[PDB]
Amino acid sequence: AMGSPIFGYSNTQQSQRVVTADNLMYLRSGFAIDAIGTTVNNLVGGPVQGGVLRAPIALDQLQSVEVTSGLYNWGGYHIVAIKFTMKDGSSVLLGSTHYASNKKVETYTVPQGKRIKQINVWTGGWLVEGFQFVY
């Protein structure tokens, strides 16, 4: 009712970012998810120097998410891919499903009438291990 569940894992360090009036979610990704934020300057995760910045997600138009996490081929357990499906049916896939094993796929629909106001991000300083929407 008050937020999404925690996708992925929650054993690393949680930071919190406020969604702006643009209602945008920014990510750095490559073979996995490196960082998550709400501006190009406040991303939480690995260092800018670690993946590369992608186009942001319009949270006001986000319908559902499909989050792939598992044993990363280069070590540990992290979120390796997120697929964002928008209200109009189009989707975008950031990260990759192909460089991890023992994989879990989490699906969740953004409830009707909710605005995503904060994003919680769990990161160990290298990759993203979990994230959560707050309404």
Author numbering: 820 to 868, 872 to 957
Paper text:
β-prism folds in V. cholerae are not unique to VCC: three additional β-prism domains exist in two biofilm matrix proteins called RbmC (rugosity and biofilm structure modulator C) and Bap1 (biofilm associated protein 1). RbmC and Bap1 are related multidomain proteins with overlapping functions, involved in the surface attachment of biofilms and encapsulation of growing cell clusters. For simplicity, we refer to the two β-prism domains of RbmC as RbmC1 and RbmC2. Our results illustrate a common structural mechanism by which vibrio toxin and biofilm β-prism domains target glycans on host cell-surfaces, facilitating cell lysis in one case and cell attachment in another.
RbmC2 apo crystals were obtained with space group C2221, with three copies in the asymmetric unit. In the apo structure (with three protein molecules in the asymmetric unit), glycerol molecules from the cryo-protection solution are found in the glycan binding pocket. In two copies of the asymmetric unit, a water is present bound to W948 as in the mannotriose and GlcNAc-Man structures. In the third copy, a hydroxide group from a glycerol molecule replaces this position. As previously stated, the loop containing the N871 residue is unstructured in two of three copies of the asymmetric unit and the ordered copy is in a different conformation than in the ligand-occupied structures. This suggests that binding of the ligand may lead to the ordering of this loop and that the water molecule coordinated by N871 and W948 may help mediate this interaction. Comparing glycan-bound structures to the three copies of RbmC2 in the apo structure asymmetric unit revealed differences in a loop (with the sequence PVQGT), which is not present in the other vibrio lectin domains. Aside from the rearrangement of this loop, only subtle side-chain rearrangements of F850, W896, and W948 are observed between the apo and mannotriose-bound, and GlcNAc-Man-bound structures. The all-atom RMSD between the two ligand-bound structures is 0.21 Å2 and approximately 0.34 Å2 between liganded and apo (compared to 1.2 Å2 for RbmC2 vs. VCC β-prism).
